[PDB]
């Protein structure tokens, strides 16, 4: 398939990766940096983030969603169903609005597409009607983060995908913190795209610390598979 093809050209070996982040949650500004590489034959993403305005007025985990889904390995039997793929290089826009539970939400807007050989995520962020003191800007959320199926359905309407999902982060009491995700991706293209039958990606996600780092950051270990279409 000439298409499937021209996305399996862009992605094979180790596509080098840059995030740019720029936040704005309740007036704490920030910027974040990442760089890292992606793997998609094995569904494989490492990345490393760097507050690069000072300390990061929010949780590290609570940005682990915003900060790849083109990485994402579909198995051979799902290749006509990789939209994310089949819109590169030209990229697609990711849009989300987070909702935590009993706090404020986070609406993003991303770029998703190649800069050369580098694949590039290009984010603005602006979260609003959060607690000074709850779960966020309180940072009272675990450094760790759980697995999650991410289900992905087509926009026919809009040539596009929308991703619904809810993200449960640990709370250092022992509760959870609901963040509940809508999300839209549309091509920034006007070629054609695959749209996708309902499937779902397999997130798991580890978070660490660089040894050698002083700056406030986040190490990202990701491995995506999507599934549900037998």
Excluded at 94 to 102: A, S
Excluded at 154 to 163: E, H, L, T, W, Y
Aim: charged letters at 25%; hydrophobic letters at 35%.
């Amino acid at each position: 398939d000439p298409m499937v093809s021209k996305g399996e050209e862009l992605f094979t070996g180790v596509v080098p990766i840059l995030v740019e982040l720029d936040g704005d949650v309740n007036g704490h500004k920030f910027s974040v940096s990442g760089e890292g590489e992606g793997d998609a034959t094995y569904g494989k993403l490492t990345l490393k983030f760097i507050c690069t305005t000072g300390k990061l007025p929010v949780p590290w985990p609570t940005l682990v969603t915003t900060f790849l889904m083109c990485f994402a390995r579909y198995p051979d039997h799902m290749k006509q169903h990789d939209f994310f793929k089949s819109a590169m290089p030209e990229g697609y826009v990711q849009e989300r609005t987070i909702f935590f539970k009993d706090d404020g939400n986070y609406k993003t807007r991303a770029e998703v597409k190649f800069e050369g050989d580098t694949l590039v995520n290009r984010i603005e962020l602006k979260g609003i009607d959060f607690k000074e003191d709850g779960n966020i800007l309180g940072h009272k959320l675990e450094y760790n983060y759980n697995s999650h199926n991410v289900y992905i359905m087509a926009d026919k309407q809009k040539n596009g995908i929308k991703v619904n999902f809810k993200i449960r982060h640990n709370i250092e009491d022992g509760s959870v913190q609901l963040a509940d995700h809508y999300q839209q991706n549309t091509p920034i293209g006007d070629g054609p795209v695959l749209l996708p039958d309902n499937h779902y990606l397999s997130y798991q996600s580890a978070l660490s610390k660089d040894p050698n780092e002083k700056r406030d950051h986040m190490v990202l270990l990701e491995f995506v598979t999507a599934a549900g279409i037998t």
